């Protein structure tokens, strides 16, 4: 009171089914009013729709507009893992498995993620297990989530498998393949798969720039397997790990990757053979 | 009436007589962050015109084979004003921003600069060239400071996705024979409420020439670029004793 | 708002940032022939989009010492497009039209063409140059097709008459330092509600250099000059095989 | 009707039986209003 | 629309499409002498179209070293057509002025005339350098006739008052890029209601390159300053002979 300097967004959701339909025009003739002419700088996409450059007929569109809803295009089951437990190497004839959670490892599924900043997501994972040349064999097999700061198994009978609190999935090589539903996660709203950043305060020497771009919130723990039992399984195993986005929702769109994938952690490239997104010819003025 | 414009904030005015507009990105404006999403229990502080003001960065100069250069938020902030003070005094911050990108030149003069905005601005390395080495980017590359860095590949803007598409993101062109300067008022994006103003960079603001700068010998080649930002509903919490990183 | 415009007819549009109004010839608008005037009893076909649309002619190129060309309507467009084939298979005709005329330079070049419509622009022969002649001009010369004609004698016109009052048509200016093109609609006008589009010509439009075209040495030296015309209320009646002439 | 797409002069006479009067002026001194310029 | 401009008065018509307003001195718009002020008891002629009408002076020639000009009001036009006559067959005389300075430049050019009016402008001499020297301006002087002077020592005014506060009164600029005319209308201001055109001058009209005229070579070097000016309201009293001084 006897201090007086102590006292949104213009834009929101519709619902479009179908395609918009095409209204029927005329010619025009006439000064002041200029639809096809456009200024690109402000930042804006050109308003100039069909009716103003030509003369059209009318169109009752119905084409729907419903499989490009995101929902549409992620729900579908994509291969995020490919884990092998062989009977002779250097590999694993331990008969178990621990494998740390990340699914940046496969091109088709992350080139599709990566259109978006940040997702938010349930999911469904599907494992499909057989021997490598893909025969079926009556194997007992247990997967086990152990979440960080979860005791990871160190052999085929550590205590960690009494799971008595993290979930595991006992199935047969034989049955179909396992199926299950996970929750969002995340400490944060959002997983991202950017991150322009640095998990950690400190100095930033050469030494630990493996850190820039390593977000933890998207760093959700171990998948391990194991063949039930005390005693070794005469059989190598194969298993192929399938995620499904359910329950989706995408915030801010970006380029699509252009190079091929490197590193399941960065968008390191190959600097000396670059790829032009567009293939080429010999002259501008001919196909 | 859409060419002329003036902002003013803090105790800084900005004036153009060329202007293609504003943009606001995403067309959300920044807002303090509300109770229903936020997390930390203390109240936060909330300087007003000490922080959320214009200030001025170095120039850069535009040359006929420049590739074009990139700058971090907040990190061209941190220690500028009180505005630094308060990033290092705090563990949590939280901002949006208006851009303000300046280059005049002659009405004799061509070329085309595209001003973008894109969150999360992570950057990759030539991996060896041969793609064999997983290298990284260095602390001064991935926040250059106040000065900013220069693209070395900014047709896959250092980080494998093409510049073409780029658009896609917020922006504006500074195309020399329409105008001479951008403008655009971002609003906070994060996955979290508030942040470090250290540890993560929110969004990279790119420059980069893609229609070069041209002109007939005699006329002025000196043609700088000068960028100018005012933070917007800037909030901070968490404080504690002064970090630089 | 008078110097901006947009002609949208047919799958063609034209724009101009630098125009000076439209003129509509004798102030009236072009119009299918009403049954009160009409003579022949045959229902007539009127295409609509397939002929009333812009059709760009050959270029001609402005120098210092260019003369004028000249264009003979309908003739210019009898071997065109679906606008030629049905003025082909059809004894009558008759339409209006939409002209034109383009022509940009720069801030530092200068001169004026005058873009008039003249009806019945009936030519004459300069007579053996004694007058003692009785000479006329070809085919060529009273029909020169889509490629115009050039003017031997404009301030006569080539036709005894003084170009100074060629103003008394529906015209306009091209003056380089104003605008860069000329708009004139013109109806269809006849002592006959319908007529040949082969035998004979409604009229001429005229182009010419008044004031010469003029530039310091340097300055692009190509200013071109095209024509675009689009048919308005095309009509067509008495159906037959196709004759050229 | 389920097709859709299938659905002058600005100049009269006067009488003018004597030429045009002229109505006295005075000075007029002022911005914006220019009727000795025109556009041939 | 503020740009623009017309001045009709008389028979005479002034036209500009690069003004900057127009402005009336203190405030007060011309007007004859009211029966209150007045004091001679003689009806006054007010001639009216006759006299009150624009006058063109001679030219001047603006060079990059130009020390800037003056004219004294009413002298200027005490020998100039029937307004001149009436000035000298009269005793008492009283009027305002509309005074308009016009030059005109390219977009190339560069400069600033600072134009204005300084009533009662009386003139001072260097007193012969030292000072101890009681000199006098000459008639030739103090009423330069329709021809104006020059100033030897603008900076003072040759009054030994700053030009820095010129703008205290009536004033325009005329500023290169931005116009190419100055417009003030100004008032009657004495101490008496009537006086002699000829031995008293009301004010003076000043036109001083405060910024310097430049171009590069091979622009055109001509550039003229012409004054244009207008009785408004003049009244005359005390009818006679004739009187050249
Ligand atoms: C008993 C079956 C257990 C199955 C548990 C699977 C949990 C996996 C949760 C999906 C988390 C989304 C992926 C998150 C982050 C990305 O991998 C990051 N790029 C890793 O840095
Ligand atoms: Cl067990
Ligand atoms: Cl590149
Ligand atoms: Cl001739
Ligand atoms: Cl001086
Ligand atoms: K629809
Ligand atoms: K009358
Ligand atoms: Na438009
Ligand atoms: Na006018």
Same mark, same amino acid.
């Given at each position: ?55 059209? /007929? ?95 198994? =160190? ?8 799971? *008595? ?8 090589? =034989? ?14 709203? *959002? ?30 723990? =171990?998948?391990?397997?194991?063949? $039930? ?35 399941? =952690? ?22 | 009436?859409?060419?002329? *414009? ?28 509300? #109770? ?5 229990? #203390?109240?936060?502080? /909330? ?17 006929? #084979? ?73 602390? *001064? ?50 996955? $979290? ?53």
């Amino acid at each position: 009171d006897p201090i007086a300097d102590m006292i949104r967004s213009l834009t929101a959701l519709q619902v479009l089914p179908t395609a918009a339909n095409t209204e029927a025009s005329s010619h025009r003739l006439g000064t002041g009013v200029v639809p096809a002419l456009q200024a690109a700088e402000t930042g804006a996409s050109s308003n100039a729709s069909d009716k103003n450059l030509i003369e059209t /007929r009318c169109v009752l569109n119905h084409h729907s507009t419903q499989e490009t809803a995101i929902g549409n295009f992620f729900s579908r089951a994509g291969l995020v893992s490919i884990i092998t437990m062989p009977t002779t190497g250097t590999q694993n004839t331990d008969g178990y498995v621990n494998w740390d959670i990340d699914l940046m490892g496969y091109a088709q599924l992350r080139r599709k993620c990566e259109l978006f900043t940040y997702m938010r997501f349930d999911a469904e994972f599907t494992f499909v297990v057989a021997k490598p040349n893909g025969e079926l064999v009556p194997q007992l097999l247990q997967y086990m989530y152990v979440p960080p700061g979860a005791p990871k198994p =160190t052999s085929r009978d550590s205590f960690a498998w009494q799971t *008595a609190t993290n979930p595991s999935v006992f199935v047969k090589m =034989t049955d179909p393949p396992a199926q299950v539903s996970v929750p969002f996660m995340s400490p944060a709203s *959002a997983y991202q798969w950017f991150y322009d950043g640095y998990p950690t305060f400190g100095e930033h020497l050469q030494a630990n720039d493996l850190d820039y771009g390593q977000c933890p919130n998207n760093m959700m723990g =171990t998948f391990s397997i194991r063949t $039930v039992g005390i005693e070794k399984s005469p059989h190598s195993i194969t298993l192929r790990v399938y995620m499904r986005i359910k329950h989706v929702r995408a915030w801010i769109p970006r380029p699509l990757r252009n190079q091929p994938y490197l590193f399941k =952690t960065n968008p390191n490239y190959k600097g000396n053979d670059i790829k032009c997104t567009s293939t080429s010819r010999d002259k501008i003025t001919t196909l | 009436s859409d060419r002329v *414009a003036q902002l003013t904030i803090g105790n800084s005015t900005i004036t153009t007589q060329e202007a293609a507009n504003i943009v606001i990105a995403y067309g959300e404006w920044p807002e303090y962050c509300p #109770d229903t999403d936020a997390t930390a229990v #203390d109240k936060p502080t /909330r300087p007003d015109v000490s922080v959320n003001r214009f200030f001025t960065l170095d120039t850069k100069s535009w040359a006929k #084979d420049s590739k074009g250069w990139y700058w971090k938020f907040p990190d061209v902030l941190t220690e500028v004003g009180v505005f630094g003070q308060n990033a290092q005094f705090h563990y949590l911050y939280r901002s949006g921003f208006c851009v303000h990108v300046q280059c005049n030149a002659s009405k004799f003069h061509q070329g085309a600069l595209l001003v973008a905005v894109l969150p999360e601005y992570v950057l990759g390395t030539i991996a060896g060239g041969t793609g064999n080495e997983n290298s990284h980017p260095p602390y *001064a590359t991935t926040q250059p400071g106040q000065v900013g860095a220069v693209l070395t590949h900014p047709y896959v803007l250092d980080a494998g996705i093409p510049l073409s598409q780029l658009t896609v993101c917020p922006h504006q062109w500074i195309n020399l024979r329409t105008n001479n300067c951008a403008t655009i008022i971002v609003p906070y994006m994060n996955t $979290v409420p508030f942040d470090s103003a250290l540890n993560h960079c929110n969004f990279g603001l790119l420059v980069i020439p893609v229609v070069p700068l041209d002109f007939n010998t005699g006329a002025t080649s000196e043609i700088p670029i000068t960028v100018t930002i005012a933070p917007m509903c800037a909030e901070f919490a968490g404080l504690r004793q002064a970090v630089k990183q």
